[PDB]
Design a protein around this ligand. Sequence first.
Ligand code: THP
Ligand code: CA
Ligand code: CA
Length: 129
Amino acid sequence: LHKEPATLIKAIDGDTVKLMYKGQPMTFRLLLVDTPEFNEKYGPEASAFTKKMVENAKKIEVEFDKGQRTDKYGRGLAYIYADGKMVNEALDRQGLAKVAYVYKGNNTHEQLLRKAEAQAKKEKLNIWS
Ligand SMILES: Cc1cn([C@H]2C[C@H](OP(=O)(O)O)[C@@H](COP(=O)(O)O)O2)c(=O)[nH]c1=O
Ligand SMILES: [Ca+2]
Ligand SMILES: [Ca+2]
């Protein structure tokens, strides 16, 4: 996989963010994770965590997997890095997201994210309280 530079437009919620990518606005849905909806428990906490992570990044990178690049709503499907730290993994590790929507094409970082989830689970963090 390869990391491509992108710039922030706006945070949306825990697992969705609007970036400029190749000079076009594009909403991105985070691969392999599901943060609670904003209107659910831990949703606000997930939204704030992702927002803080992307707004404080000097550098944002988009990393597509080997399968489909866009979902049925036209959102890019990617791993998103903020100063070299993967937002998908970070949410997982804090128990603000769970591993989800695991599809065969697009699962390069599955074991890593499950590893993160297991640690959050062990620590009974947030969602795993
Ligand atoms: C992570 C991911 C989500 N999605 C779609 C499935 C869900 O659409 P459906 O609601 O029609 O089932 C949606 C959930 O993400 P959001 O909740 O941010 O919209 O994103 C994919 O299609 N592939 C993916 O890899
Ligand atoms: Ca979302
Ligand atoms: Ca979600």
